[PDB]
Nucleic acid binder design. Structure first.
Lengths: 210, 200
RNA sequence: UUGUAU
């Protein structure tokens, strides 16, 4: 309208400047819930299950959420530690035909969703990267390698935007840590290729401290 | 349908769609590493933090993304880009730089399509180290580098200064190869993984 | 520490 106030919006397109709110770690409350044990009792049991499942429902589709907070204006990724030395992002396997984002909201709620009844919604608007697994082996890559026509798994990473305050419940078998970016950066020996390239995957975001 | 924040579709075209001529050499303002950091200090005191922008132009070959790199010698590769002028707009500046380095000289309008930021790197000191985040307690970074995805038109003519060679590097060549390309180019594969690339 | 460019 030319007969009224102009409500000024961010000028650059969201493709060019994507602004994201980070709140302090101390804004969040953490509790404990029942342990979530893995579907696989060992490595062998797991690439075996991965082969079997591949034959009768196709390529495995995984989604994972990157949750970010800050401490004195420095971004930290929330990582689940499966006992000493092993870290994973929240997320997991999509059901057949399941929407990626609906699937990740499902999985975020299972792993970290509060128990006390206060409903906790997840804001998931951004894809931050993609990883493919060309064989039934541990190795993954941020592209589909040459001559790979039937990748065995496809993993999609998403930025999960947190509310100003929230309560999370951590399954008993896990510890939650907040890893600063300098800790992840150039540290594949500590976190693997996927987690340790998060700093890079996060660098395009214009973070707001609060 | 899907927010361009959730899904970003980009059209790639074959390398052969593009033809590469040459023009007169375009020499860097600094002739050595030593002079580069010397000039970084002057301009720092004078006009403040260096604002640098660079362009990632992608093509495909048999359905695999290749990034175009300017090879200055047998061991050094750079992305099209450069230093912004004080106050100058980032995308406007980047367009200016891409035309200097790669713009055809046959009078034809070359319009660069720059819609997407793909990363940021900061240089805390007047030394080589760059990080994809402002490191802890660095209040005054000396350089801020910003990377953009440039969507190429369907066919184009580019003119490469006789002192550079343009190359198309497949992602598997860049990935896990900081030793060959540095920390910035060698992580373009990760930075590019989010895009849904259409082959044509 | 991808760096001098015949």
């Amino acid at each position: 309208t030319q007969f009224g106030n102009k409500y000024i919006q961010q000028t650059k397109p969201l493709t060019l400047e994507r602004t994201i709110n980070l709140y302090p770690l101390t804004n969040y409350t953490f509790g404990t819930k029942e342990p979530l044990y893995e579907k696989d009792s060992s490595v062998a049991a797991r690439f075996q299950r991965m082969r079997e499942e591949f034959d009768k429902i196709g390529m495995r589709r995984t989604v994972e959420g990157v949750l970010i907070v800050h401490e004195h204006r420095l971004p930290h990724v929330l990582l689940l530690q499966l006992g000493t030395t092993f870290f994973k992002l929240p997320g997991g396997e999509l059901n057949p035909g399941e929407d990626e984002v609906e699937g990740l909201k499902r999985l975020m709620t299972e792993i970290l969703g509060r128990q006390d009844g206060v409903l906790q919604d997840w804001v998931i608007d951004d894809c931050i990267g993609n990883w493919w697994r060309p064989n039934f082996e541990p190795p993954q890559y941020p592209y589909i390698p040459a001559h790979i026509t039937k990748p065995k798994e496809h993993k999609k990473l998403f930025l999960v935007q947190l509310q100003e305050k929230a309560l999370f419940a951590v399954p008993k078998n896990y510890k939650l840590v907040a890893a600063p970016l300098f800790e992840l950066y150039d540290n594949a020996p500590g976190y693997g290729p996927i987690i340790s390239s998060l700093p890079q995957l996060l660098s395009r975001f214009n973070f707001i401290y609060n």
